[PDB]
Design an enzyme around this catalytic site. Structure first.
Site, PDB file in Angstrom:
ATOM      1  N   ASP A 271      46.529  36.020  38.431  1.00  0.00           N
ATOM      2  CA  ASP A 271      47.856  36.606  38.227  1.00  0.00           C
ATOM      3  C   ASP A 271      48.796  35.593  37.591  1.00  0.00           C
ATOM      4  OD1 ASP A 271      50.252  37.968  38.312  1.00  0.00           O
ATOM      5  OD2 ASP A 271      50.068  38.552  40.410  1.00  0.00           O
TER       6      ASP A 271
ATOM      7  N   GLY B  70      31.320  42.635  36.434  1.00  0.00           N
ATOM      8  CA  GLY B  70      30.747  41.869  37.527  1.00  0.00           C
ATOM      9  C   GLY B  70      30.811  40.370  37.299  1.00  0.00           C
TER      10      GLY B  70
ATOM     11  N   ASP C 128      51.855  27.599  32.519  1.00  0.00           N
ATOM     12  CA  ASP C 128      52.159  26.505  33.448  1.00  0.00           C
ATOM     13  C   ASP C 128      51.393  25.189  33.372  1.00  0.00           C
ATOM     14  OD1 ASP C 128      54.048  28.269  34.536  1.00  0.00           O
ATOM     15  OD2 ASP C 128      52.615  29.025  36.022  1.00  0.00           O
TER      16      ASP C 128
ATOM     17  N   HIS D 256      33.347  34.480  45.249  1.00  0.00           N
ATOM     18  CA  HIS D 256      33.158  35.928  45.229  1.00  0.00           C
ATOM     19  C   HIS D 256      32.274  36.316  44.046  1.00  0.00           C
ATOM     20  CE1 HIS D 256      35.867  36.630  48.467  1.00  0.00           C
ATOM     21  NE2 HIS D 256      36.980  36.380  47.800  1.00  0.00           N
TER      22      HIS D 256
ATOM     23  N   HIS E 294      37.567  29.411  45.120  1.00  0.00           N
ATOM     24  CA  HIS E 294      37.504  30.510  46.075  1.00  0.00           C
ATOM     25  C   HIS E 294      37.025  31.784  45.386  1.00  0.00           C
ATOM     26  CE1 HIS E 294      39.014  32.960  49.537  1.00  0.00           C
ATOM     27  NE2 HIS E 294      39.236  33.851  48.589  1.00  0.00           N
ATOM     28  N   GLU E 295      37.669  32.126  44.275  1.00  0.00           N
ATOM     29  CA  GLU E 295      37.303  33.326  43.534  1.00  0.00           C
ATOM     30  C   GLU E 295      35.877  33.272  42.997  1.00  0.00           C
ATOM     31  OE1 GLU E 295      38.947  36.070  43.597  1.00  0.00           O
ATOM     32  OE2 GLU E 295      40.523  35.084  44.765  1.00  0.00           O
TER      33      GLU E 295
ATOM     34  N   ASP F 188      50.682  42.235  41.273  1.00  0.00           N
ATOM     35  CA  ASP F 188      51.988  42.638  41.785  1.00  0.00           C
ATOM     36  C   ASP F 188      53.205  41.747  41.550  1.00  0.00           C
ATOM     37  OD1 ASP F 188      50.846  40.707  43.272  1.00  0.00           O
ATOM     38  OD2 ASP F 188      50.943  41.717  45.204  1.00  0.00           O
TER      39      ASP F 188
ATOM     40  N   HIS G 237      34.645  37.028  52.393  1.00  0.00           N
ATOM     41  CA  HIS G 237      35.549  36.152  53.126  1.00  0.00           C
ATOM     42  C   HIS G 237      34.919  35.636  54.415  1.00  0.00           C
ATOM     43  CE1 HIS G 237      39.267  38.092  51.045  1.00  0.00           C
ATOM     44  NE2 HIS G 237      38.938  36.960  50.451  1.00  0.00           N
TER      45      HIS G 237
ATOM     46  N   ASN H 135      28.719  43.836  33.043  1.00  0.00           N
ATOM     47  CA  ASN H 135      30.078  44.188  32.645  1.00  0.00           C
ATOM     48  C   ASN H 135      31.118  43.331  33.353  1.00  0.00           C
ATOM     49  OD1 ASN H 135      29.565  47.797  32.143  1.00  0.00           O
ATOM     50  ND2 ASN H 135      28.823  45.973  31.059  1.00  0.00           N
TER      51      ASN H 135
END
Ligand SMILES: O=C(NCc1cccnc1)c1cc(C(=O)NCc2cccnc2)ncn1
Ligand SMILES: O=C(NCc1cccnc1)c1cc(C(=O)NCc2cccnc2)ncn1
Ligand SMILES: [Ca+2]
Ligand SMILES: [Ca+2]
Ligand SMILES: [Ca+2]
Ligand SMILES: [Ca+2]
Ligand SMILES: [Zn+2]
Ligand SMILES: [Zn+2]
Ligand SMILES: [Zn+2]
Ligand SMILES: [Zn+2]
Lengths: 169, 166
Positions: free
Chosen positions: B99, B93, B25, B123, B119-120, B76, B129, B91
């Site tokens: 997706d 981590g 994309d 983490h 955002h990711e 999904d 969150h 590893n």
């Protein structure tokens, strides 16, 4: 804001489990009795609650399988590896798998399902292996022959370091 | 007894990342700039520094994949899960997976890659969150349409509680 917890553990006291399938070695009643007793070993010394689900997605998915069965830890036929469980976490975290090429029993022959399950659920809850030879979490299956099961202190201290003792009496 | 250790934050201030592959994309240039911008969000408010590697294993491996892509946390198809990242550690981590059944963009139609990546990466650095509806780390994607990105104070306080200010 929120930072990830210091230890790998479930952030809720209410947990669910599901027996996805059954081994050919024992009746459904025997397997259910064994797993219920195994979860009680941990709920008895913490504030944790375990509710059984007959279908759908539960926190702790339980299943019997052989060789390649859906993860990076394929079993190896009779003998050797017997079971494993994933630590607390999303999706497969907490799930417990039993090698159905082993012999499972409710007695002292082969591997006592209750005993192995209690051990695996320890992993499902956040406990790794212990160096105490008499601990439930010791890495090597060591059936004692005793009729009454009593969770060793090492395991009690370990699980309570994660979830607290719940009602102490 | 032993419990499972949790690396609450990276033990070093200099981290490496690698863009393993690219989404259909956007152009390579757009993807590269989006991830660079996403890392700048966190380095701008902490002592953290990020350096891009073009090969080998980096602390934060970035890749696009669909359905089952190698870690048994399958995506999904269109909608639903957008991406996920592993908390600090060895590893997997720190790694971030996007997706590719979702439509990604920077200046056209689809989910803003930079925004999701920022955002990711939060983490990847040790942030969970937030409950604040307007924070970057809030669980629900909510594009505001503004051309300028400003890290919400909640996220600033959160990341700084781990690494401190720049
Ligand atoms: O062997 C042990 N731990 C290591 C282990 C356990 C599972 C899998 N891998 C490694 C173990 C065994 C026993 C025990 O025999 N208790 C008597 C008992 C057993 C069954 C029903 N009623 C009474 N107690 C504590 N830890
Ligand atoms: O939606 C948000 N956070 C929740 C979230 C984010 C990712 C994935 N899942 C859940 C979010 C969005 C924005 C925002 O639109 N800013 C304007 C902007 C966007 C792109 C480029 N320049 C300026 N600001 C703060 N938090
Ligand atoms: Ca085996
Ligand atoms: Ca699970
Ligand atoms: Ca990594
Ligand atoms: Ca999706
Ligand atoms: Zn398995
Ligand atoms: Zn074990
Ligand atoms: Zn993934
Ligand atoms: Zn998130």
């Amino acid at each position: 804001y929120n930072v990830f917890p210091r230890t790998l553990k479930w952030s809720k006291m209410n947990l669910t489990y599901r027996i996805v399938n059954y081994t050919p070695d024992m009746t459904h009643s025997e397997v259910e009795k064994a797993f219920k007793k195994a979860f009680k070993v941990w709920s008895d010394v913490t504030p944790l609650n375990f509710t059984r689900l007959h279908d759908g997605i539960a926190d702790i998915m339980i299943s019997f399988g052989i060789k390649e069965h859906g993860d990076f830890y394929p079993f190896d036929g009779p003998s050797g590896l017997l079971a494993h469980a994933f630590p607390p976490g999303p999706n497969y975290g907490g799930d417990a798998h039993f090698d159905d090429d082993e012999t499972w029993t409710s007695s002292s022959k082969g591997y006592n399902l209750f005993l192995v399950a209690a051990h695996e659920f320890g992993h499902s809850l956040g406990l790794d292996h212990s160096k105490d030879p008499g601990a439930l979490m010791f890495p090597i299956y060591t059936y004692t022959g005793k009729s009454h099961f009593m969770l060793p202190d090492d395991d009690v201290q370990g699980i309570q370091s994660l979830y607290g003792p719940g009602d102490e009496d």
